[PDB]
Amino acid sequence: GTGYDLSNSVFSPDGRNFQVEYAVKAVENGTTSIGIKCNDGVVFAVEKLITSKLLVPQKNVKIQVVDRHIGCVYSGLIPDGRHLVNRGREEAASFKKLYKTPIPIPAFADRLGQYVQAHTLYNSVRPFGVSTIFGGVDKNGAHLYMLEPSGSYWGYKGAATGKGRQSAKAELEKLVDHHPEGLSAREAVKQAAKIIYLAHEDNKEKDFELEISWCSLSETNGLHKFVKGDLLQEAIDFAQKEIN
């Protein structure tokens, strides 16, 4: 029959969970955001659509930090994303408290993963309406991750989600081919600014605001920090320039 798509944990005849798939639609309908893994860190950047001149510039921040070494950015239902970070923050605090050592990126990824997967197990909850890109530097390197509403996630060289995920992924793939030796933190920040400018065409109607953040063993000491001032403008320009 039908109706397999009205309750969250129900398997459709072809083995799918439509509510999760519908959650994905909410994600694809959202702003584009990406993550670029460099040779000793990771860079996060997102598109911030300017609804009106009333939005105080630089204020409504989206990138979120977990602990002191993890960065998280997401596309979709923003409130859901905050919820997922709040959880990740507890998950991290819990881990540090017992093991002393701040939570490894992989370990943190699964914490988010299991929690998200949990919301596809019952019909009394709704799946998360966000795909999240997060990462950081830990005991052994940098790690970039992307987590779907299904709870699925993998390690990435570069990752994108949202409205312009295709332009972004296209761009990211070029970078991966043209840089087998690995991009640098400084380079990735710029590259990132560009990919957003490019991927903004799928929303060229509304004006936007750029936001970048990074975590590099050499550039930030392994701590997540937001790109501001000069370094930001320098990347904004590098984009504005290659957009023509």
Partner: protein, 244 residues
């Protein structure tokens, strides 16, 4: 949510009837017939075993007549398993009463309590009612020999003679036709067998298809005795009354 799959077992029909109770009774109507007849010197309980085989061990069997107290027994009509659940709590209630007042529980008190438990599954909890109707046959020093009957609704009443299960309408008319206030246990034993004999949906009324019990006050003693007839005993009383 779950609301989608809730049958709402405890609601009223537009006519002010309880669906589940009505349907449970419908279920009871296809259960082996059970008869109860109260005489001046005792009570008779007779029931027809629903479904049997050559290989069914009748000696170790019991599916209709259960001992609750040493002075109270019941005849079952409906889901045997549902009955056992209620029978056990009934047996406990009898003992709490005894441990508390150091006196055996008066028949009606035990019957009312059991009926209240049923009434409950009727007004709250969202669970299905018990598919069971009981004929209680007991004796106490306040009302002497008593006969009661309770059903899924939780309602109970007293009788001189009564039936539950299949073909109750037919059986009641036959009983209401040959019953006499001054009867005697042996008379009732016969009236009971005759009634079942005429309402059975089977070919003949053999002993392997019956359970019999009498609660008499054996004159040579002064106390009350419950007797659950054994296969051979039913086979005898069957020949004697002229059913061979």
């Amino acid at each position: 949510g779950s609301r989608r799959y809730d049958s709402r077992t405890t609601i009223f029909s537009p006519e002010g009837r309880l669906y589940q109770v009505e349907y449970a009774l419908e279920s009871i109507s296809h259960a082996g017939t059970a008869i109860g007849i109260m005489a001046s010197d005792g009570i008779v309980l007779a029931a027809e075993r629903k479904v049997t085989s050559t290989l069914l061990e009748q000696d170790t069997s019991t599916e209709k007549l259960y001992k609750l107290n040493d002075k109270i027994a019941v005849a079952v009509a409906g889901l045997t398993a549902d009955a056992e659940i209620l029978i056990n709590t009934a047996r406990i209630h009898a003992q709490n009463y005894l441990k508390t007042y150091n006196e055996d529980i008066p028949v009606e008190i035990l019957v009312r309590r059991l009926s209240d438990i049923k009434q409950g599954y009727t007004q709250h909890g969202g669970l299905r009612p018990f598919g069971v109707s009981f004929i209680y046959a007991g004796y106490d020093d306040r009302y002497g020999y008593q006969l009661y009957t309770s059903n899924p609704s939780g309602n109970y009443t007293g009788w001189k003679a009564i039936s539950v299960g299949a073909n109750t309408s037919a059986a009641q008319t036959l009983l209401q036709m040959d019953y006499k206030d001054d009867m005697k246990v042996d008379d009732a034993i016969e009236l009971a067998l005759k009634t079942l004999s005429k309402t059975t949906d089977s070919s003949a009324l053999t002993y392997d298809r019956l359970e019999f019990a009498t609660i008499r006050k054996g004159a040579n003693d002064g106390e009350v005795y419950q007797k659950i007839f054994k296969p051979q005993e039913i086979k005898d009383i069957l020949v004697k009354t002229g059913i061979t």
